[PDB]
């Protein structure tokens, strides 16, 4: 990427709906480069670190 | 060919609701019934949705 | 019931609920309930009759509109059930528009016709939150001329169709019920008996009774198509019978 | 003196090809009286739901099937006084039609026409759109027809077609039953069945009406004829 | 879940009693629907309820 | 009109004047022309002509004439073309089920007429033919046969469903399974049953086999 | 100490510092239960209405 | 009250446009699309009826596609409803227009007028604007064959092949893509209309009942407009078999 020029990916935006298989697609890539694929639903449910967003950044 | 779809819930879901009533039945195979009762409701449900807003779920 | 959702500004307005619900209208039915008017309307073949309770605040009174019988036309008649404010408004309108049918038809106007007429205005009320629906009930009651008797509920939308026998006020599905027994029991009409099984049906649904001064019959017979209020002494006539009657 | 209140527009625009104060009014008709209209191929038979659920009804001339012309007839299924200005209306315009054509006026052309203020109420603030749909019968270019006007404006066009309680399973069990070529005592039979599976509980003769389009003309079938026709079949 | 045990059964009676993390596409196969009007039942309902206590002679 | 009109009458003189046996040569004669017939509406041409040859299916009978007769009903099926006519013919057909004759051409009829419900027109027929077939068999105890009969259709009809004459084949199904001793068949026809026949609405008969 | 790893109660000391023995995962709950206790009023048997529910439930 | 709302109808919004006007947008791409190509020596317009079900009788046999004028047609993009009042101004416009003019009317001059009443109600009135977006086809001698486009934006555009309804964006290029500028004949051009209504449509599987095809082809000293019957369009599904495979080749 830093011969390509454009900086490391900020935002990748997946979008369409389900049922296509692309969450599917984006765990089986997660798993070969050893990122933690962490899984948010829409939720702040899974900030438990103070467990409100916009602190759910930091 | 016949589902319209729409979502990540109802693909699998056409498999497990066949199972499902093959075993509500009491019968070890999976009778030819059982896939066309299961994208049937689901199909259903999907392609009425154009027309006026309805849901899977509440 | 339903308090309905918004998705419009319903909340306020007579527009849509998911109920199928008209808000206006439904403040309508608790209209009737403030004035504490019910009556039972009863159909025969010798007569039409309408009985329903006179309001008495104090004994200074002229009965001309004190009263809830109204003449809506000289041979069909009428009471208007509910809150009084909005039964004289509707007894207004209505007055007009019956005189508009008098220049238009020429003559006395049939039962059907004229529940009808009513009811096309009142779509005109329902439809708008511009001027609220009169919450008012009105049982028309008079002899259609070839037909007979009939009795005609409108509701403040404006719902009307043919019953065998009707009831309005406070709460419609307690007083037909017990209609329904009566109206079973089919007696043989004649004068007698059909002012007499109305007079008995709106006593047992109050359980408080009443003397014939307290109420107001109104019949159309069959004897003169003059629309017709009975008065305290021949509704007294009923009366004693029909204590002699089981 | 004057009125205002409400004049804004009160109707949103939902993606479904329909605003949603208007869907909200299809539900309405549904919780409506069951009606059931099928055209016969000799006349078109509709029947509706004669009763509001009191169980004392005296008709003679009170019906919900009620001839607005020579040949035309409506039985609906919602609203009560949202019904009696369009059969104040439809007569007014079937007239219109009598003195241009000196014919009444076709399925097709009543409802546009009445479609027409269907709308206006949608659109428009301070009123709310009609809470009736028609089944509009009537005999014209040699074939008889049945129209359904839908509580929007919207038009569907239907051989076979149920209205009231379960009215959506109605269209679905008429689209693959639908008959023609029925004999006029037939389609009183056929009709009656139908009117049996969308409508519950008591069949008498004061629980349901039935009126018949034909070549003589629409008319409305007298209490005790209904009757004959509902004992007839299974 | 696929345990000797019932899978856990819920009810809600909102769209804002569910929760996003709940409501995810990939966790529920399956949806169950639930009437109630039908005139069928009315009869079936009223005859075993009556059948379960004491028969009169006066029994329709 | 005509199998009204001069048919119904030309049946009840030949049987009223001259005898049994010299009438079933009359009788042969006109449902040939019946096929044909001089129908003004195919629909109620054919609900009539099931209808009076219906009055021979009850007795039941073993004649000549009852075993001929019997091949006439299914073209005259065919050729009705409507939905309300399919529970008239089969009230003749539970008739002619419950006064047996052989067993043999009870059941041969019904197979044939399964089969020609499919070839000229309609599932919805075929499907209503069945209901008989099966009922037949387990008195028979030709349950091998039921069972091939009744598990086959299933999937077939179940694009097709909306209407009320379905259910009826199901409900069958499930009585002549359960008496076979096999009880997870028996359970999947009932599994089938009450989800299919939603409210009861449907024929006296249909409510009364749903019960 | 090979049946020591799953997910379940457990005992260790205070200040005699061992883990002492193992508890099922059974122990620990408050909650309380009725089997079929203070009995609703219904009844698979004293219902025959919901017929089309009548498979959904009996399945899942 | 009535003061505590917002529906910004003729009020400004912060986007510095009504939400009204750009909510209409949003029904129309989810009901029945509406096309018009040109020809040579015609213009035709095609639709797919409001009318997902299975069963018509074709009481009314334009349900989508109304002939207003003996020189004019006109399709719906969007909901009936708004459809039925537009369509009864729509014959008196195009009638009147004629009484005075004497030549077939000018498909520009249409729209101009009609978008103008379109943008009256969204402004002003307190009315929102049409949930329709109609589909003129006609006829002058000073521009020859025309297909017009409305909106309820009270926007017209002047076009060549043009399709608004459902999947407008997909569309538009499939018209492009097969049919250049004065390129394909009436005829051809029939065909062409169905192929992309096949494609197109809020739900699956293309019949006589779901289409009505209309043509404006001028004949010997008439242009005539006829809407036509199931029996024809049926030839043109076939047709439409036909072209799929020319399209590519």
């Not at chain 4, 739901?49 to 409506?74: A, N, W």
């Not at chain 6, 105890?141 to 199901?170: N, T």
């Amino acid at each position: 990427f830093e011969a390509l020029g454009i900086a490391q990916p900020k935002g990748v935006l997946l979008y369409g709906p389900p049922g296509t298989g692309k969450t599917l697609l984006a765990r089986a890539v997660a798993h070969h480069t050893d990122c933690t694929f962490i899984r948010v639903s829409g939720s702040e449910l899974v900030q438990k670190f103070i467990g409100e967003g916009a602190r759910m950044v930091r | 060919e016949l589902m319209p779809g729409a979502s990540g819930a109802e693909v699998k879901g056409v498999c497990t609701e066949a199972g499902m009533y093959a075993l509500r039945e009491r019968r070890v195979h999976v009778t030819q019934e059982d896939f066309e009762m299961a994208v049937a409701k689901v199909m259903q449900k999907d392609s009425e949705k154009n027309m006026s807003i309805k849901k899977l779920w509440k | 019931m339903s308090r309905g959702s918004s998705a419009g500004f319903d909340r306020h307005i007579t527009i849509f609920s998911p109920e199928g619900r008209l808000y206006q209208v439904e403040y309508a039915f608790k209209a009737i309930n403030q004035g504490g008017l019910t009556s039972v309307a009863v159909r025969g073949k010798d007569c039409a009759v309408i009985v329903t309770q006179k309001k008495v605040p104090d004994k200074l009174l002229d009965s001309s509109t004190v009263t809830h019988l109204f003449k809506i036309t000289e041979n069909i008649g009428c009471v208007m059930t509910g809150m009084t404010a909005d039964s004289r408004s509707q007894v207004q309108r209505a007055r007009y528009e019956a005189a508009n049918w008098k220049y238009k038809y020429g003559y006395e106007i049939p039962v059907d016709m004229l529940c009808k007429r009513i009811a096309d205005i009142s779509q005109v009320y329902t439809q708008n939150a511009e001027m609220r629906p009169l919450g008012c009930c009105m049982i028309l009651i008079g002899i259609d001329e070839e037909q007979g008797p009939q009795v005609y509920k409108c509701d403040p939308a404006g719902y009307y169709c043919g019953f065998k026998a009707t009831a309005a006020g406070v709460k419609q599905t307690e007083s037909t019920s017990f209609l329904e027994k009566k109206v079973k029991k089919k007696f043989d009409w004649t004068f007698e008996q059909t002012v007499e099984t109305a007079i008995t049906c709106l006593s047992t649904v109050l359980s408080i009774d009443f003397k014939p001064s307290e109420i107001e019959v109104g019949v159309v017979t069959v004897e003169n198509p003059k629309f017709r209020i009975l008065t305290e002494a021949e509704i007294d006539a009923h009366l004693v019978a029909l204590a002699e009657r089981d | 003196m004057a009125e205002r209140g409400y004049s804004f527009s009160l109707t949103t625009f939902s993606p479904s090809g329909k605003l949603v104060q208007i869907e909200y009014a299809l539900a309405a008709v549904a919780g409506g009286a069951p009606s059931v209209g099928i055209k016969a191929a000799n006349g078109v038979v509709l029947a509706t739901e004669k009763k509001q659920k009191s169980i004392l009804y005296d008709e003679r001339s009170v019906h919900k099937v009620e001839p607005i012309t020579k040949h035309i007839g409506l039985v609906y299924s919602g609203m009560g006084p949202d019904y009696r200005v369009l059969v104040h209306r439809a007569r007014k315009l079937a007239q219109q039609y009598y003195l241009v054509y000196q014919e009444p006026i076709p399925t097709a052309q009543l409802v546009q026409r009445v479609a027409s203020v269907m709308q206006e109420y949608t659109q428009s603030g301070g009123v709310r759109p009609f809470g009736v749909s028609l089944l509009i019968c009537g005999w014209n270019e040699g074939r008889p027809y049945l129209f359904q006007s839908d509580p929007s404006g919207a038009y569907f066009a239907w051989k076979a077609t149920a209205m009231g309680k379960n009215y959506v399973n109605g269209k679905t069990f008429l689209e693959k039953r639908y008959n023609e070529d029925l004999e006029l005592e037939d389609a009183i039979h056929t009709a009656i069945l139908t009117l049996k599976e969308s409508f519950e509980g008591q069949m008498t003769e004061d629980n349901i009406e039935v009126g018949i389009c034909n070549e003589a003309g629409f008319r409305r079938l007298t209490p005790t004829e209904v009757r004959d026709y509902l004992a007839a079949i299974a | 879940d696929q345990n000797v045990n019932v899978k856990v059964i819920m009810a809600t009676n909102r769209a804002d009693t569910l929760d996003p993390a709940l409501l995810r596409p990939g966790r529920l196969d399956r949806k169950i629907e639930f009437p109630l009007p039908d005139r069928r039942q009315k009869r079936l309902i009223f005859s075993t309820i009556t059948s379960k206590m004491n028969l009169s002679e006066e029994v329709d | 009109m005509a199998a009204a009109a001069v048919v119904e009458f030309q049946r009840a003189q030949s049987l009223l004047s001259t005898d049994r046996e010299a009438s079933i040569d009359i009788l042969h004669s006109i449902v040939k022309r019946d096929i044909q017939e001089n129908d003004e509406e195919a629909v109620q041409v054919k609900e009539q002509s099931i209808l009076e040859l219906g009055s021979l299916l009850a007795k039941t009978g073993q004649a000549a004439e009852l075993g001929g007769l019997l091949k006439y009903v299914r073209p005259f099926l065919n050729s009705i073309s409507k939905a309300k006519a399919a529970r008239l013919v089969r009230s003749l057909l539970d008739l002619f089920l419950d006064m047996e004759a052989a067993t043999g051409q009870e059941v041969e009829l019904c197979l044939e007429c399964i089969e020609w419900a499919k070839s000229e027109k309609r599932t919805f027929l075929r499907q209503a033919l069945e209901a008989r077939l099966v009922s037949l068999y387990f008195d028979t105890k030709r349950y091998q046969e039921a069972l091939h009969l009744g598990s086959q259709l299933l999937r077939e009809l179940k694009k097709m469903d909306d209407k009320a004459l379905l259910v009826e084949v199901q409900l069958l199904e499930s009585k002549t399974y359960h008496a076979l001793s096999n009880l997870p068949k028996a359970r999947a026809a009932l599994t089938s049953a009450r989800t299919t026949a939603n409210a009861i609405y449907c024929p006296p008969k249909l409510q009364a086999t749903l019960d | 100490r090979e049946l020591l790893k799953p997910n379940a109660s457990v005992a260790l000391h205070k200040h005699s510092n061992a883990l002492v023995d193992v508890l099922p995962p059974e122990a620990d709950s408050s909650i309380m239960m009725l089997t079929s206790d203070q009995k609703p009023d219904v009844m698979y048997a004293d219902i025959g209405g919901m017929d089309i529910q009548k498979q959904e439930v009996r399945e899942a | 009250m009535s003061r505590r709302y917002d529906s910004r109808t003729t009020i400004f919004s912060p986007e510095g446009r009504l939400y009204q006007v750009e909510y209409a947008m949003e029904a129309i791409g989810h009901a029945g699309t509406c096309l018009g190509i040109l020809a040579n020596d015609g213009v035709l317009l095609a639709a797919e009826r409001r009318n997902i079900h299975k069963l018509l009788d074709e009481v009314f046999f334009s349900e989508k596609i109304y002939k207003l004028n003996e020189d004019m047609a006109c399709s719906v993009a969007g909901i009936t409803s708004d459809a039925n009042v537009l369509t009864n101004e729509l014959r008196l416009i195009a009638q009147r227009y004629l009484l005075q003019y004497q030549e077939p009317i000018p498909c520009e001059q249409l729209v101009t007028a009609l978008c103008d009443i379109k943008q009256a109600y969204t402004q002003f009135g307190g009315k929102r604007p049409f949930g329709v977006s109609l589909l003129y086809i006609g006829w002058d001698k000073h521009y020859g064959f025309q297909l017009y486009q409305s909106d309820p934006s009270g926007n017209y555009g002047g076009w060549k092949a043009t399709c608004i309804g459902n999947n407008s964006a997909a569309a538009v290029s499939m018209l492009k893509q097969d049919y250049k500028e004065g390129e394909m004949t009436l005829k051809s051009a029939l065909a062409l209309a169905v192929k992309v209504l096949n494609k197109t449509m809020d739900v699956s599987k293309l019949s006589a009942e779901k289409v009505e095809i209309a043509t404006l082809t001028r004949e010997n000293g008439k242009t005539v407009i006829r809407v036509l019957k199931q029996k024809e369009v049926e030839q043109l599904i076939k047709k439409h078999e036909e072209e799929e495979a020319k399209a590519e080749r």
